[PDB]
């Protein structure tokens, strides 16, 4: 199990380094965009010409490598937490037997140790881990909300905001209250940033309650 997870960690480190190194070295230019240095570090794109130029700025290579940073540190912390939980429980055979396959990882680490967290509050009452349960579901919510910004892009929301602008300007009473800055959909880089922040914050706020509440409940 240690062999396999270490090679997975090597995979994740090499892929994160691949993304970051490619971003750094192609920041100046590329065959699809030799004049990238003129545009700079963080620009949305070069347009749909030449087949499409999404995520070409090498800020988008930070954005894309942040996902792999979260992935690799998540794998590392899963490994540490499970191998230490079994040893604290004096049940290292469980890790040595079940860590060699992903079903064992999903069953004996997440599903098994998630009970004291999700049972922080239930229909019959609540314990001191109710705060941790709330946070697990809150981090879940933030992580899921990041997917909206990461998947849905700007034109849909710009048209929707145009419709909302029409409605506000045309309704009576409320039209007396009028904005000063024209409302617009978030920019491409802005929404990439917001979605990445939601992803990362949901990641940390849904793993921290798990790693603390399960360890506290088991006390081993």
């Amino acid at each position: 199990g240690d062999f396999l997870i270490h090679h997975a960690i090597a995979l994740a480190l090499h892929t994160t380094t691949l993304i970051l190194v490619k971003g750094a070295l192609d920041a100046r230019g590329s065959k699809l965009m030799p004049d990238k240095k003129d545009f700079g570090y963080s620009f949305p794109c070069d347009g749909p010409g030449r087949g499409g130029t999404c995520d070409i700025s090498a800020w988008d290579a930070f954005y894309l490598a942040m996902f792999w940073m979260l992935n690799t540190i998540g794998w590392v912390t899963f490994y540490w937490h499970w191998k230490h939980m079994t040893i604290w429980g004096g049940n290292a055979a469980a890790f040595n037997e079940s860590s060699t396959y992903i079903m064992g990882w999903l069953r004996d680490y997440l599903w098994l140790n998630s009970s004291p967290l999700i049972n922080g509050y239930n229909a019959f009452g609540m314990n001191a881990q109710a705060v941790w349960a709330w946070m697990f579901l809150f981090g879940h919510l933030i992580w899921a909300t990041g997917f909206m910004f990461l998947i849905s892009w700007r034109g849909y929301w710009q048209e929707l905001i145009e419709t909302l602008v029409w409605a506000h300007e045309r309704t009576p009473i409320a039209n007396l209250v009028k904005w000063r800055d024209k409302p617009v959909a978030l920019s491409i880089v802005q929404a990439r940033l917001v979605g990445l922040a939601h992803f990362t914050i949901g990641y940390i706020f849904t793993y921290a309650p798990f790693v603390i509440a399960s360890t506290t409940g088991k006390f081993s």
Partner: protein, 80 residues
């Protein structure tokens, strides 16, 4: 507003002006090209930045190039 520039690799194909949806670009006489014309951007303030000119440009790399910059009502293309 965005900055529209035309480099001397132009070949007077007048396709950028056709792709232009805001009348930012026009052909002006020139010596370098055999067609005797070059694209120019006298109305860059009306540019919105969709880069249809860049899409339509057939040079190996773009003779016409658009650099996004300061945003305005016209550049954002807000009807409100």
């Amino acid at each position: 507003s965005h900055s529209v520039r035309v480099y001397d690799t132009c070949i007077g194909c007048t396709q950028c002006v056709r792709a232009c949806p805001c009348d930012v670009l026009e052909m002006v006489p020139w010596d370098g090209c055999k067609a005797g014309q070059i694209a120019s951007a006298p109305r860059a303030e009306d540019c919105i930045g969709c880069k249809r000119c860049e899409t339509a440009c057939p040079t190996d790399f773009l003779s016409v190039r658009v650099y996004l910059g300061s945003e305005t009502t016209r550049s954002l293309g807000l009807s409100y």
